[PDB]
């Protein structure tokens, strides 16, 4: 069968902002994307210099 | 065509029409496989020039006024007149077509000449169809009221399915039954259904069941034409066939007018006529016409 399919628990790898299953993720998304893109921007600035 | 042939019912019904009739109604709805790519513009031009004419057309409208349609038709559809061909007549012959393809379930259909649409006997054949059974009215129902299903299920203890088949045209019609059953049990199912129709033909019929079938017929006919699509289709069919509109109330009166002896007469016409059978699947145990 296929309905027995169930994603294994990824909680050991998730960030602290999205650990709770009972909380909307749209609120924290901008912070996470902004952090990652800040890392990328800093790297680009250094390489450009 | 390939999409339409994913359903076994389409193939079986087309073969059944090929077997029953000889000239006119034997033509399939789809192109023969050999003739694909061979149809030329001259054939299309001839077909349209011969068949698309004023005396053979009807224009139905829902949501527009009468003068607008009348103006449009007078301006354009009148010049198309010049009525052409007339067509053949339906010749009934009967026969068998058996096509083995090694599928899980065996489909079969056994029919005979019944009647012409828009006739007194057509209502009797519709009532007989609903007496015998025309599919389930309840989700995952046992078909308790369906006489054919209960007759077959008493002996056969495997999954199966059966229903009554009816198809009326302007000059001829087919009445019978369609079965779906596993390869080993096909003969049992067909024999049981044929026996049940025979018992109905001999005279065993209860007036409560005739009334229940009449109520099923009335409910189905009324619920069919609730939508705009169904209403337009019914009006167009009546306009082409009879050239006049019959409101639902007259149809209901005609349905109630059918006498219970006419259903017995229809069963007698079925049981004593040249059968036509079509089948498909692992045909290792399906009977022939002579065996029935």
């Amino acid at each position: 069968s296929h309905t027995d399919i169930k994603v294994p628990d990824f909680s050991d790898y998730r960030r602290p902002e999205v650990l709770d299953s009972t909380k909307s993720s749209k609120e924290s998304s901008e912070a996470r994307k902004g952090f990652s893109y800040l890392v990328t921007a800093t790297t680009t600035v250094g390489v450009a210099y | 065509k390939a999409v339409a042939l994913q359903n076994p019912q389409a193939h079986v019904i087309e073969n059944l029409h090929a077997a029953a009739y000889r000239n006119a109604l034997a033509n399939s709805l789809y192109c023969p496989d050999y003739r694909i790519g061979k149809v030329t513009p001259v054939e299309l031009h001839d077909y349209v020039q011969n068949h698309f004419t004023s005396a053979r057309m009807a224009l139905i409208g829902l949501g527009v006024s009468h003068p607008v349609l009348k103006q449009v038709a007078e301006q354009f559809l009148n010049i198309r007149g010049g009525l052409g061909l007339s067509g053949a007549k339906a010749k009934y012959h009967g026969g068998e077509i058996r096509e083995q393809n090694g599928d899980s379930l065996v489909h079969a259909a056994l029919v005979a000449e019944s009647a012409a649409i828009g006739s007194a006997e057509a209502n009797a054949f519709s009532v007989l169809q609903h007496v015998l059974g025309a599919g389930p009215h309840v989700k995952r129902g046992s078909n308790a009221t369906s006489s054919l299903y209960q007759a077959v299920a008493k002996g056969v203890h495997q999954p199966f399915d059966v229903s009554a088949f009816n198809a009326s045209y302007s000059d001829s019609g087919l009445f019978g039954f369609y079965t779906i059953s596993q390869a080993a049990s096909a003969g049992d199912v067909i024999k049981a259904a044929y026996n049940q129709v025979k018992t109905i033909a001999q005279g065993n019929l209860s007036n409560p069941d005739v009334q229940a079938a009449k109520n099923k017929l009335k409910a189905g006919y009324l619920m069919s034409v609730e939508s705009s699509e169904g209403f337009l289709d019914e009006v167009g069919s009546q306009a082409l066939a009879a050239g006049s509109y019959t409101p639902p109330s007259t149809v209901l009166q005609q349905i109630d007018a059918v006498a219970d002896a006419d259903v017995i007469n229809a069963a007698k016409k079925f049981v004593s006529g040249r059968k036509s059978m079509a089948a498909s699947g692992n045909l290792g145990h399906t009977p022939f016409i002579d065996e029935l």
């Binding site: 296929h2 993720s25 | 006024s65 009215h137 309840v138 017929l217 409910a219 609730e226 639902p248």
Partner: protein, 446 residues
């Protein structure tokens, strides 16, 4: 002589009332002779834990199998005494039973429905038979690839929440469901505040109200103790799920993002945007002249057998995206063209395509509600989702206010630079990596 606005204003209004036990009775008069009457319930798989998952589907199977007062297969015969069609369905958030019949059978038909949703006998032998049938259905459901892919999309998108659970539930749960669990489910979820009794056709509102007062006054609606199942927000996760089966001929793919929800103003704009993208099947007759760029490109280049767009709504969440069936050597092309069209909508939308999409949505809305069953379904879903039925005039008012700017802003909000959820089934070796799909959600030029 008439007009579009005048025609919209002329539709009769739905009338709604509420009994003392909490039941809500809605109806809409019409001149047709037939009618459709049904009961909608706010209880699906989302209100089920792992212990009792699939209970609702099991109860729905046993609904038309006799009651205390119509034992055995008598009830079925009664329906077929009057030539009525008795049907039901269940989803992740709703359940419904309904009957199509004549006007004259409105007294009897309602008397059947109250029998069904109150006095489920649940014979043990019938429980065993339906257990076997449900096991057979679970085995046979693997043949439908579209439904498998949609279940995978739900499981990966809403992992770790009730929305991951499928309607039928796992095969292990159904083998252990007992009559105690089914009775507890019925006693907990089937209650008057969560039910809606809708009708539509040839009838009068007060007669239905009186019949409901006769046959539904026994339902309890006190919410015994704190047994008040309330939903909670569900976490959405961008992720991928891939089932590789190279033996199959075609690949099924479904990609989605998080949606606004049931009662958001944005939804109308999204329904316009999807209408711009459109849909295509290999049997369509338009060919290469179709308005949608994706459909025309797929038709000319034969990129896929079929595709479609969807916007599935739940309480405060949903899925918004596309699903296509294609060859195993065309997945990159289809994904590229689809994401390019989404970015085109986000960054640059013009007036003509938005007008076309608005006309499409108007026509679809008009044509969908034409009959008795769709109107009854509309009433039943509206009274549970919005708390009231929205007239078509309000829908026209909402649709007419959309323009290119609104579509651009909404699409930029919900599509641009978002983590999607992806599900693939079949020969999917050519499906791009998740990093490539993610990087295709923006443009360097913009």
């Amino acid at each position: 002589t008439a007009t579009y606005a005048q025609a919209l204003q002329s539709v009769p209004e739905t009338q709604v009332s509420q009994l003392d036990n909490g039941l809500r009775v809605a109806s809409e008069q019409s001149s047709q002779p037939t009618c459709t009457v049904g009961v909608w319930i706010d209880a699906g798989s989302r209100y089920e834990s792992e212990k009792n998952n699939g209970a609702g589907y099991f109860v729905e199977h046993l609904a038309f199998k006799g009651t205390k007062n119509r034992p055995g297969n008598a009830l079925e015969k009664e329906v077929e005494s009057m030539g009525a069609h008795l049907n039901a369905y269940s989803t992740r958030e709703h359940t419904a039973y309904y009957i199509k019949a004549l006007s004259k059978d409105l007294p009897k038909a309602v008397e059947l429905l109250a029998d069904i949703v109150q006095n489920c006998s649940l014979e043990d032998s019938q429980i065993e038979k339906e257990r076997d049938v449900i096991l057979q259905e679970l085995q046979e459901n693997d043949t439908s690839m579209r439904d498998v892919v949609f279940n995978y999309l739900h499981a990966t998108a809403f992992q770790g929440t009730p929305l991951a659970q499928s309607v039928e539930g796992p095969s292990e749960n159904v083998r252990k469901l007992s009559r105690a669990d089914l009775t507890e489910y019925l006693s907990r979820h089937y209650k008057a505040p969560r039910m809606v009794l809708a009708a539509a056709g040839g009838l009068e509102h007060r007669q239905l109200l009186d019949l409901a007062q006769k046959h539904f006054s026994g339902l309890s609606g006190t919410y015994d103790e704190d047994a008040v199942p309330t939903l909670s927000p569900c976490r959405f996760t961008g992720s991928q799920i891939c089932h590789r089966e190279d033996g199959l001929p075609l690949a099924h793919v479904a990609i989605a993002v998080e949606g606004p929800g049931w009662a958001h103003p944005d939804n109308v704009a999204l329904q316009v945007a999807n209408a711009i993208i459109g849909h295509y099947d290999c049997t369509y007759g338009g060919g290469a002249h179709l308005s949608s760029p994706l459909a025309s490109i797929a038709a000319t280049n034969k990129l896929c057998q079929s595709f479609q767009t969807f916007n599935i709504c739940y309480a405060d969440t949903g899925l918004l995206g596309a699903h296509f069936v294609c060859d195993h050597m065309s997945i990159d092309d289809m994904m590229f063209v689809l994401q390019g069209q989404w970015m085109r909508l986000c960054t640059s939308a013009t007036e003509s395509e938005v007008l076309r999409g608005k006309n499409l949505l108007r026509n679809a809305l008009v044509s969908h509600l034409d009959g008795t069953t769709p109107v009854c379904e509309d009433i039943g879903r509206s009274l549970l989702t919005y708390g009231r039925r929205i007239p078509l005039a309000e829908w026209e008012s909402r649709i007419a206010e959309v323009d290119a700017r609104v579509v651009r802003e909404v699409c930029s909000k919900y599509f641009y630079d978002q983590c999607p959820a992806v599900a693939g089934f079949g020969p999917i070796e050519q499906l791009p990596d998740y990093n490539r799909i993610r990087s295709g959600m923006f443009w360097l030029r913009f």
